[PDB]
Structures are given as C-alpha cells and as structure tokens.
Symmetry: D2
Subunit: 475 residues, 4 copies
C-alpha cells in the first residue's frame, strides 16, 4: 500500500453533496483540511493552482521507479558503470526533505535549526558518536547552498534513493578507494560533489530532453491519479470567485495532463456535458518559473494554443477569452484578476517554490498539498501507542539511573520511525520535528493530503487555528 | 516608572542564597527565566556575554534622552533647522522593533509575515483603509533591506522617536511641501530615504566620534545600572565552566564600563576581596563585529592592555593569562576554549546580531535579555482583564451582526495596547504577535528581563519547554 | 573571389624548401608574418593552436551561407515569419567586428574609443547628423555589454547579415509598426534586444544541437580548406619544441576535422608515411572554454578516445602518451609541458578569447590568424591610389574654403571603403582605424592571413618591430 | 633642482602676448603641448579643470615631505615602532606609477603588459634571475587589484618611498623575522598586505582627518606654486567658451587654495581689477568623486557658500549665478552647460580618475598635466647621447658574440635610468615604455608639463598627430 493507493481510493468515489455527509466525511483525518493560521474562506476571491503533484498526482511507486530507471540509464549512457543498471527503486528507503551533504556524501534528516536527526552514508546509518567525526556539534548550516542540497519535492524521491545507491555501490566495489570526500579509481577522482551534480544533471535531462514525459503520457492511467471530484470542486470555486493555473510545466505537457484529468464522460457532475479543462480557469499561465515568478518574474509571453509554440514578442494585451500566458510574474495574476495577495489562496506542493516564496514575497494565502500525508496519518494513528509511550518517557526523564532511561528513548524512537520507512517520518524523528515539518507550520496556512479535501467544507467556512502565546504570556 | 526602574529595584538587593529563597523568588514572573526550547544547564560548558544592554543596562529614559539630544545637535550642526533643538525625547512614543519605511516615511509595527499592525506617519496613526493607499494588501517584504530598516535594539529608541519628530516637523512647517516620498523647499528635495540616512549617520557619529561615551563615562551612576549580584553570578559560572566576553565595543570603553560594573568594596559576595573585572573571564574579546563574527569574522588581533591600542599584526599565540583579543571569529572562542556550539550559552540583547546569527550559523545555545520585559510583564499582568476579554471576543466571533462585534475587537485592542505606549507592546498588537515576538520564540532558547535571573536557578537545572505538535498530530 | 579562395590557392601548393625560395616567397605580402612587437622565435619552446578558423579554415561563402540557412530555418521553426526563408546570405554586406546595439537595432563600426564610424539600420546607412538623434556625441560605451554585442569572429558573419535582414524585413513589412526600440504587431512587442537574443540563441543551437556539424562533416571538401603544408609545419615545430592543441570544440568534432586536415596519402612531406593527426601533438586539450581557460578554467577531465565520452571523475595523472584532456586551464599546459608563458606562442583567430585574454592574463606570446587579410591586402594594394589621395587631403586640410574640402574627404573615404564591402574594411574606415585594428596592434605580437606563413621563416628568425616613441620623446 | 623648481621658474614670468613671442616660446620643449590624437581647439566649447596638481601644483619636495612626515607620525601614533620617526623623505627614490605587490612586498615598475622592468624589495633592487623565484615568467596580472596597487598620483609619492622604508626597516631590524609574505615578531605576524593597508589608511587619514590641509593652508607660499598667468588663461578661455571646475576636494579647501591661486594685486593682466576666483568659472562643482563621477555619480547637492556646509536635500534648480554644486555626475556638466562630450576638454593630472575614465566612459577630450615632465624633459634632452647609443645597440643586436652585447645593453639602460632617480624615468626603463607611458599615449589627447602651455597657442590651433598605420598597411 503506497500513499497514492490511499489517494486513488477516495478518488474513485463520486461526491455525495448532502451537507451532513460532507460535515461527517470531513472529520475523518484523511480528508481534513488542517489549519496553521486562521483563514476565512469568504475572504478568498481567487483560487490558484500548481499542476504537478497538486492537480496531477503521480501514482507511487510506479512513477518514482520510471524516473529512477531513466535517470540510471542516462548516467550509464554518459559513462557510469554498467552495474547501475541492476539498481531497482525501493520506495521504503527515501523520505522527502532530506539534505544531501556534497562534501562527505551523506543523506541527512535535520530539524529546523539544522541539528542532525538521521545520517546515512549509503545504506549505513551513522550513529551519534561517529557522526561527530564529520559533524562536530552535530549541526549543519542548512543555508550553505554550495554544500547542501535539500531534496524537497516528490520529484527528488528517485534521486534520494539513487544517491544512497551510488555511495553504497562505489564504497563496496573493489575497483575504487573511498576517501573522505569521494572515490579514487587510479588517476580519476570522483568527488561526492561531482557525483551529486551528475545525478542532478541526469534528473533534469530525463525531465526536459529524455523520455519521461513521453512514457508518462502514453500510459496516463498507469502513472497519474484521476478523480471525478476535481472538475466538481473547480466549478464550485468558479461560482464564488476566480480560478487560475500557474504552473512551471510547458503548454504541451500541461494540455496532455490536464485533458486527462478531465477525461470523464460528463462535466463537473455525472450527467453534465463534458467541458474542456480550459473552461474551468479564468487565467492559465504556463512556464511560470516559480519562485522567480514571485519576484521580478520573466517577460509575459502568449502561447499559440494551436501549435504549442510561444508567439514572438512580449504580450501587451488585456486578459481576453481563450488566451494562455507564458512567463510573467505573480503581479500578472494580481493585475489581470484585480486581486490583492490575501484574496488569493495558492494551492501547491512545493514547500519552497510554491508556498514559502508566495507567502514571504507577496503575502499570498497558502494551501500545501502533502500527498504522503495519507500514509503518514495511517502510521501515526495506528501506532499512536508508541508515540504516547514516547511522550511519557520524555517527561519522567525530566523529573530525574538515566543510564538506562535514555536507552529506552533511543530504542523507542527508532522503532516508531521504522514504521514509516528507513528514513522515518516526513514530519519528525521521535519527539523532534523536521525542517520540513517546521516549514509546513510556518508558511502553509492550510495543508491536506489532497486539495480535494476542500470539497467537504462549506462555501464560507472559517478555518480556525489556536492563538499562540509566548512563555511569559501564559505564566 | 521606566523599565530600568524595575531592573534597578531588584539590583539594589544582595542575594539571599538559601535554596528555598531562590526557588520561591524565582517563581515571581519578573525574575523567571522563560524557556522556548528545553535546555540542560548541566550540558553548558561555556557562558558567553555581550556587554551593552546585557551586562551594562543603561538607565531609561536618561540614556535615550542623552543620545537623542546629541543626535539632534549633530543634525543641526550639519544644516538641519534650529527648531530640532526644541525636540525633547518622549519615552512613551517608541516601541522597539518598529520598521521605518524609507519610501513613504512611516514607522510600521509588523507581524512575522510583514502584515501591518500599526502605521504612523509622524504622530498621525493611519487607520486601515488609508494605509491601503500606500500598502495595498497591508503587507511589506520585510527583507527588502534597501527600503525597510528594522529598529531592533535599545540603541534605536532615540532614532525611532526622532524619525517621527522630523516627519511631524517637516509636515507641519509651512516652509516645506509634502510629497509622497519627501519634502520640497523650493529647489531642494529631501526624500524620506535621504532624511533617514542622515539620522542613521548622526546616531553612528555620536556613538563613535561625538561625545556620548564621554558624557556616559563621566556620570556612570546617572546612566548605567550597577548590581552587586553580577560579580556573584559570574564567579558561580566560573566554578561550573568557562566564562567569556565577546562585545562589539572597543577596549577602552569596555574597561571603563566593566570596571564600574564591579565597583563595589567587595568581591563576589560582601566580605570578599574585590577583584578586577578581567579575572572573572577566561577569554575577553573586544571589537567583535557581530554578526560578521559568526561567519568569517575578521583577523585576530591582540589588545595592548596598557595603552588600549591594538598591537600591530595578527595574533598567532595561544590563550594565555592576561591576554585580550580584538576581532577574530566565533571559531576563535570554540578553539581557544575547546568548545562545540551547543556547549555555549551566549547571553545578549541583539535579537539579530547576538541571538539569531549565533543560532543559525553556529548552533550556539542562546539567552536573550529583554530589558523592557519588566515593564511589559507589569502591564500584561495588571491589565490581564482586557486580554481575557479579547480572547473571549475572538472566539464568539468564530461561532457567528459582526458589524458591531469587530468594532469591540478594534476598540479593545487599541486600549489594551495604549497601556504600553503609543506604539503598543513590544510583543503584540491585540491578539496578533509582532515580528520581534516571533523571533524571540524562534531563536532565543531562553529569555528573561535580565541575565541575573539565572542566579535563582540551581547549578544543573533543566529548563523545560512544551513539545510542539502539528495540527494533524493532535487530531 | 572570396578571401578563402586566396587561402585555398596558396594551399594547393607543395612547399619548395630551398632557403632562397622561402626568403623570396616570404616577402610577398600575402605570405608575410606581420610584427607588432619583436619576437625571437628561438625563445619559443611551445607552439599552441586553436582549431576552428586557425587550423581548419572554412571556405567562404559556402560555410557562412550554410550557417545562415540553418539559423534562419531554426528561427522560422520557433515562430518567426515564413518570409525569412527567402533571405539568402550575401557576403558583400557584413564586415567582422561590428557592434550590434540592442537598444536601437543598429549595426555599428566603431574605433578604439567607441566613436561611430558607420551606422546601419537594416540596410539604410545613417549619415552623420541623423545618428546624433540616437547617439549624441557620436559615441558608445563599448564595454556596456548589456547593450552592445561585438560580432568578433568569423562565426558571427551569418548573424551580422541576418540582424540587418530582420531589421530590414520588419521595418518594411506592413504587419508591423516601427518604434524606437522595436516593432509592434498588435498586442505583441518585439524589442530589438529580444530579437537579438533569439538570433544568438539560434546560432548557438545550430552549432550545438542542430545539423551544422553534420552537414559540415559529410562534405568536408565543400566546407573546409585542406593544405598539405600544415603537416609539414607541425613536424618542423616538433623538432624545435613542443606542440599543443587547445580548442573549444569537443573531441568527436575535433577528430573528424583534424583527421581530414591530415588526409593526404603521405606524412609531413610527399613520400613519407602518413601519420595520425594525434602524433603531431605533445598535448591535446579539447573543451577548453577559452577565455575562462585563461583564468581558473574548469576541472581537468580525460577523454575516452575510443568512445568520445569523458571518463567520469577528475584526471589526476601525469602527461602520458595517448592521453586527451578535456577542460582544465592554461596552467594545465604550463605545468604539463614545463613552460612559462613567454615560452608559448599561441596561434588563434579569436582576438578576444584566444589573443587578448592569453596576453593580459598569462603573458603568453600571441599569433593572430586573420583569414580575410588575403582579400584585405589585395584591395589595399590594388586601390592604394585612393588611400594616397586620402592622406594628401588629410594634410592640406591642416594647413588651412574647407566647405568643399571636407566633401572630398567624405567622398573619397566612402568609395575607398566600398571596394571592401558595404561595411568597408575590417581595419579602417577612411583614415580612421577600427576597434578591431586597434586590438590587433595591441594584443597580437604577430599576425598573418594564415599561420602557414610561419613555414617561410627560418628556425630562429627574430621578428622585429619598430620601437615606439612618445611625442615628447621624438621632439 | 626639483621638478616644481622648473614650473615655478616659468611661473614667475608675466606673459608677453606678442603673437611671434608665443609661437617662438611655444617651440621650446618645456612649454610645448604634446599631441597624441589630433584636436581642433576651435571645436572645444567647454574647458574643465581638476584642482590638485592641475591648477594647484604643490612644490616638491616640501609637500611630499610634509605628507610623509604626517603619515609616519600617524603610523607611530597607532603603534608602529618609534624608529619610523627617523625616516626622512628622499625625493630621489620614488617614481610615480609603480606597482606595490602586497603579497611579497615589492615595488615594481611594469610595462603595459605587466612585464617586470624593475623590482625593488625595500632598497634592494632584485636582478633578473632572482625575480623569477617570485615572478616566474617575469609578469604580473596588473588588473588583479586585490594583490596589486598602482601608485598613480603625485599624492602617492610619500607612500611609495614609505613602503620601501618599512620593508627595509623590518627586514634589517633584529626584532623581526622575514618570511615570504611578511614579518614575524614572536606571536604577531605582519603581512605585507596588512602593512600596506595601514600605510594607505594613514595617508587617507592625514588628508581627511589629520593636519595636512591645515599646515598646507597656513604656509601656502611654502607649499603651492602660484602663477600670474593662470588668471590670464582662464579669462581667455571664457571668451571662446565656457569654463568649469570639477574637483574631488571639498568647498572649504577648494576656496582657500583657489583664492591663493588668484591672490595678485591685479586681475587677469597687470593693471586690471582683481576678481574673485569664482568669477572665472561658469560651473563650479566640488566633491566630485571621480571616477564614479563619470558613471552614475552621486546626488547633486548645493553648497551653502557662506558656511561651507552642504544644504540639506537634493538640488533641483537650474544653473544660476553664484551657485556651487556638490556631487552629481559628468552628465550634470553636459546638461547644465549644453555640451556633448567632444565639446569638452577636461584638464587634469589623474591618468585614471581624470583622463582614462572621462575618455572611455563619456568620450570627453582630455588634457593630461604631468608636472614631472619638466625635469623628465631636461634629463632626456641633456643625456640624449646615451639613448642614441641605446637605439644603436638595439639594432646591431638584431643583425647578429652577444654574450657581451647584451651586457652593454643592460649596462647602458641602468645608467641612463639612474639620471632620473633610483626608480628611473616615469616613461621608460631603457628601450621599454612603462604602463604609465602607455596610458598617456592611449587616453590623453594632449599632455604637457603644465596646462599653462595652452596660453602659447592661438585661439583655434589644430593640434595634429601623425596618423597610425598597421604593419601590413605600410608594407
Ligand atoms: Mg508541483
Ligand atoms: Mg548589546
Ligand atoms: Mg577559432
Ligand atoms: Mg588632481
């Protein structure tokens, strides 16, 4: 059972719109909209959407495996050793949000202050004292982007596993010599940083020049979750306000994916005429280049919808029916739809490019899709027993012999985390929250396993969060 | 009653060290150490200190008034109009942490997302709808440091008032014409940004070339809080670990101020031989240039303690008795004292230069001194009635006629805030926390009205904070 | 008669090596080595070579036309109007070294101080007074690289003509409206700067992703000058010193081109065994990325000569027989061949990337190939009559009615220049030298229509230039 | 006999304005205007002037000695050893235009390509082979401004000698240990780069905070050349065009110096009413901050001529009588006087800040004052014998035993150069021109020992330079 098996379960269901069914269905955690800062839906005038892993959720692990296979094949095509071809994607290893340290070749799980929570070299998990060799003070400057790359999106799951695969492979292949910062094979030296760049280069290449889009699009049912409730929610949003798309993908890929997402023999509800996906939007903007989009952007271009090519020159006209934009900036949306930032709820999965940047730079309201939350919620509810024991121990430790009491902490956190995978939960390692968890609470006003959970809330719900108090204020 | 009147009350008291007196005295809020993240004092090996507004608290409002007077006199000396001379510092206007917007000449109180909480143009407080003229979406990109200057330290209190004074004066002086971005007087145009730079230039100048140090040092009792409990706490720290000073001030000013802070006819306790302030420290470092200190720093220099001048050349020797350093970096301290970052508790008042930077860049533990917390606590406890009514209204608003219910919110927040001053509380505006409050919770592990509150806690106390849960985790 | 018709005339000749034949053949201007600063061939220990337009001269105008055709086809493929397809390359329009001004869409010929010598908007040559509208003071800051692009290499000849073609086409096509900085077609605006970037993008694309290499390599005789005297000169250099290749091209293209350059049924001289091109070199370095090569360079890589792919990792071994390098820096050559900069004579055609940068950054000796010099010399010798009249007028103008005397200057310069082409001589406009001419004299120690002219000079010739005197020094 | 002894000889002379006296007086080399590029005086509409070492020439060696003394005293005041106090300025050591290499502590004389011509470590002149230890290839990247500082103005003559003095002193003082990059004294390390920064800091300090202006102004006759022919030339320029001042000095210093330069009991000619210096100018601009002046500049300010302070705010009015400007840009002058760049002849002594930058960035015409040219001309004319022998040897060397022929070259260049000083001529070392000589020919259209030499040329002279030919063009 993958996490997209949960999302494709609730997606096979038409929506009963009885107002008592929605209110009851909503309270079940898998379908909740969780609230970090209060938000009055009545004050939202425009709903904006990312596409990949927001409107179009790729089925796991089929999709990660395809991208891992194509990336491996690209690396062998440029000179990496044939053995890579026998790697096979394993979804139980990687967790989103890890940090690859290009100096020492470790995958790290860190908290919001860059404290080490987990450290794996290949598939060898480094325990506390040994990590102090390379990380005295057990800490990284997580903003040193020359050394550290944060694998933040579901797109990075294949490379998260692949980096571990390569470090493992070269460590144990007798042709090579392990050094602190990479591998020697005679007179060639491959630094972990060189190796990491090649992987990054290869993932980009399969997305933009290799065959991943092609293989995706010729088997959409295998790779893309489709849900009849998406065209219903979009039309319901259009009655209360404006709806826009602002995606980084190009127009040809956007059109194929979006057409499939609406490929039902009805429109919004069973019985209605099907409508083209474009009619569900007041403003369609491709090639957005977020997060640069939320600063100065690029020049506003117009897509030739017939050919998929951009018209030559900078588009100067007004919003008009039928038009598709390329490039531009967030200010394109605000001007063309007559919106201020806090009239906008932007809905996306990139904690950095979609959410953090639209909040800090423009004051937009934010909705973070976290697809793994379905499986994360399952593990967290089912094995709540262990976390409750965790919190019990954490307190009796403070009253105080703790020779053996710290041992039961470190034991209990390990086996709690293992239920999620080898890199543990996306949101925590034991009693300690991750960087990712921290940025969710900090920059996502709302979050949910799927944006579809908005369908189960009335037109003008007021999402409510608890007010926050400083220590001295609750004294 | 200023906030330094509170601190100079508890400072006139010798410390009863009965372990039941400390535990009871400690529970009184004014003397608490408040905890944002748990901290095990037993694991702290080095205590490090800022000086100004940490070890040496300047009496308010005498000191702010002196700096305001000298800054005003400097501006008139370079050409500003004589009327400035009749300005007089008013401590009830400014609150620390405001943001001056150099484009439109407004002082702003913002929350952590840059949402406008208060907006004053001179002494005219701009209400909601009118702020939308200049701030559509009622938001600023608080990291656009070319436009926005955050007045963060107690040193900025005089210029916080002075900026309002000037905007007020030029607005109402018939010689000038108000424009959106400044004032015209015939063929001269003074932009708010030009004017702001002159004020900043003048404050620097009185601190580093004018007479402020001179007038301070020739009347230390008038300007500097002195507390017999400081040499006691320092010596107690020296028995459990190492103690260091790392201040931005130069050695001559540091020596005068520190000598006075120890100017008692006894040592640590009444009855003991007085010792020079230098003997309370294992490492003394002046000219630190924090926050650059916490990155690459500057070259390590050695102070000629006899002359107050720096020796020529880069100091290459070891830590040795008697030596004073200039420049260097945080890594100087770690090497020379054999410490990792989390063995260090650094104690200071600069939320940015002392606390935020030492946490994000080095993983140091942090203790934030907030001198105004004494008065803030008084107002918050005494007028708790109003905040309790505030939180009641905030909830019954969510159940729902709110024509009149929002009016009682906006009324009640105003008169709550007024009890603090015209710019309201340092930590909140009504039910909404400030940027400053947010950075306290985020980067200060501990905080307190005074670092002296550490004296009332046992040698190896474990400061405990509540563990944090994401919404879906408490579901 | 193109300029590569001259070079392919002298190239069809085997070399008579009688020492009286070389000395006599050498004195003919077409075969001279011209000298800007004295150079003692005996002190040269390494000869280094660029490839494209140095060892491999592309036949004109076949090659420029092919690149123009492919670039035009690429632009139409991305959306430019079909009419572009009817453009046809005209070799009589462009002169190398022109400056495209992306603001106003003009091709400019400038002197070393950026003074305007010629200004063409499309095919309309703008005369003096009208250029003052857009260029008051008739001058450009030629180092403002955001606005001005200097078309410096023979590779830029197709785009030099194409830029004029497009400006002409849009100016006169009634679908568009000419503005100061570009063209409007309804709601699309194409700035000259946008248009220029598209041309630059398209030329790069045909070189690195389109078919230009493919079409070149499948008809080498049509496109590439081949000369039996090249393998003779290379072997003669190898007896006095070391020989190296440092080209920006990749290894697969380098191998095809170089193999053809040595494709004779003999070796160095008729009668000798043919040898592979690689045996003529002590150090072969591809992917050089000059001029970055002459600063920090890139990492040294090793080419897998069997597959044409780079081996993975950084090459750490020594110079060894058979090895081909990728990347690296000029310091790779100096270390591996044991050379200082002034032991090196580097031979190339890029006045900036090959010559200027190797002189200013490393102190290398320099040999500039100028292929057009053959035709330039012909025009300059044959029509010397007119330049002699020019210099006569220039002086009698100084003795002084010059109403009519300036008119004969401006007339005589025009018809002198026209004998070269519509953009006039590469080296001058009338009595005024071009930027290009200035950088030749300034940074090329030697220059010549072909590097083959070195064959006609004895092993240890001392190339001699006149010593330079300041005005006050000849007083 | 210093070089300002020559300039103060011709300055004690009233100007006979007989047109045959000027034409004859002019031909004497000391009073020539030398011409690098032809210039038609009739086309000059504005004459612009620097002040220091242009209108106000400081008497040598009195002035350099005063600045050396004050700089030495400042260094001892901050901690340098007392022995510095016994240094005494020696005008026979330094030559303008040397390059201090902050890595190895050498003064270098270089040519335009950065080839080493002279290399002195302290007062030890390093001969060829030993310089190869630190400068393989005998070359420096003269644009690496982090390592190399070019001492370009007469203001740098005191520090040129002082740098040698310090390197000499520390090398030979037994308290210190010489290392490749500086000196050790126990646990202090003084790098040459640290030491160089202290000297630079100290020279700035005496100019802007110490007493150099004060001591200058209270003994102007001792320190400043005064010439009755200056007010005559200025008034003659005002009849043919506009005259402006654009100096980096502030208004109070400018007024003292300029007032003295006009302190005669007559006006332009003996017998005329004296006029204030300000009446000789159409536009006076102080605080120019050249060369930044020739790019974006700073904001235009207005000087309060009564107080010497800048008025508050940005000056927006027009050119009006009596007004003095501060800051601004070269475009201030062009707009306010209605000039294009080539209507301007700017007259100054800074080869970089005044001449090179105004030519490359704005296309201004240029007049370089070189005060040492008077003495340089004397040495060059009087000892022409030796340079003529030099050029004879340079040629017979090319015909060819040169074991002994190179020895007579290296001997003859040494004793030629010695007649100028220990660092030799400003313009050459033997047969090789210096960087400085090269930038004179390259960027100064005219040059002269004094700008006063313009008085001896008729109103609309056409300064004529020989036209330049490339090698292949004179073939
Ligand atoms: Mg996405
Ligand atoms: Mg402080
Ligand atoms: Mg080339
Ligand atoms: Mg000057």
């Amino acid at each position: 059972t993958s996490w997209s098996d949960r999302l494709q379960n609730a997606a096979d269901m038409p929506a009963n719109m009885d107002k008592h069914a929605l209110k009851k269905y909503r309270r079940e955690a898998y379908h909740r909209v969780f609230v970090n800062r209060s938000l009055a839906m009545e004050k939202i005038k425009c709903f904006g959407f990312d596409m990949d892993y927001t409107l179009a959720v790729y089925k796991s692990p089929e999709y990660e495996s395809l991208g891992f296979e194509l990336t491996v094949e690209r690396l062998v095509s440029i000179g990496y050793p044939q053995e890579l071809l026998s790697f096979a994607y394993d979804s139980t290893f990687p967790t989103r949000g890890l940090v690859f340290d290009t100096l020492y070749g470790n995958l790290l799980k860190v908290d919001a202050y860059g404290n080490l929570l987990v450290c794996a070299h290949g598939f060898n998990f480094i325990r506390g004292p040994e990590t102090r060799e390379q990380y005295p003070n057990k800490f990284i400057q997580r903003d040193d982007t020359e050394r550290f790359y944060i694998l933040n999106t579901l797109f990075n799951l294949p490379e998260t596993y692949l980096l571990a695969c390569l470090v493992d492979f070269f460590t144990n292949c007798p042709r090579y010599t392990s050094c602190e910062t990479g591998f020697k094979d005679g007179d060639l030296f491959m630094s972990y940083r060189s190796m990491f760049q090649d992987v990054r280069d290869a993932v980009d290449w399969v997305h933009y020049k290799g065959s991943l889009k092609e293989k995706t699009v010729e088997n959409l049912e295998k790779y893309v979750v489709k849900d009849g409730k998406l065209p219903l929610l979009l039309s319901r949003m259009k009655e209360v306000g404006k709806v826009f798309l602002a995606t980084n993908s190009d127009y040809k890929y956007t059109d194929k994916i979006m057409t499939y997402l609406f490929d039902f023999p009805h429109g919004p509800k069973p019985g209605s005429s099907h409508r083209p996906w474009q009619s569900y939007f007041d403003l369609i903007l491709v090639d957005a280049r977020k997060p640069l989009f939320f600063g100065e952007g690029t020049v506003l271009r117009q897509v030739d919808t017939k050919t998929g090519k951009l018209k030559i020159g900078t588009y100067t006209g007004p919003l008009q029916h039928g038009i598709v934009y390329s490039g531009g900036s967030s200010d394109t949306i605000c001007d063309l739809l007559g919106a201020k930032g806090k009239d906008i709820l932007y809905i996306g999965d990139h904690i950095f490019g979609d959410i953090l940047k639209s909040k800090k730079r423009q004051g937009w309201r934010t909705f973070l899709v976290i697809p793994e939350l379905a499986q994360e919620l399952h593990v967290w509810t089912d094995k709540s027993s262990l976390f409750e024991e965790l919190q019990s121990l954490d307190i009796f430790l403070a009253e105080l012999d703790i020779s053996s009491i710290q041992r039961r902490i470190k034991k209990v956190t390990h086996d709690m985390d293992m239920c999620y995978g080898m890199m543990g939960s996306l949101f925590r390692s034991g009693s300690r929250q991750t960087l990712f968890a921290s940025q969710v609470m900090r920059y996502a006003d709302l979050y949910a396993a799927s944006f579809i959970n908005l369908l189960y809330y009335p037109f003008s719900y007021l999402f409510r969060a608890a007010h926050v108090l400083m220590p001295h204020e609750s004294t």
